Amino acid sequence: EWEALEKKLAALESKXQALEKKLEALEHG
């Protein structure tokens, strides 16, 4: 339970960082 929830939070954190960088790319063209 705990370990699966921690994995899902880490995957969201990684997606979170990738979407931030992608939104920054789109702002600059």
* Residues at the interface with Na ion (CB under 5 A): 1-2
Interaction between residue 23 and a second copy (CB under 8 A): yes
Identify residues 2-21 at the interface with a second copy (CB under 8 A). Answer: 2, 5-6, 8-9, 12-13, 15-16, 19-20
| One residue of 16, 17, 18, 22 binding Cl ion per CB under 5 A | 16
> d(Cα 8, Cα 17) in Å, to the nearest integer?
14
Q: Which does 7 bind (CB under 5 to 8 A by kind): Cl ion, a second copy, Na ion, none?
A: none
Q: Which tokens belong to 21?
A: 């960088």
Question: Which residue type does 24 have?
Answer: E
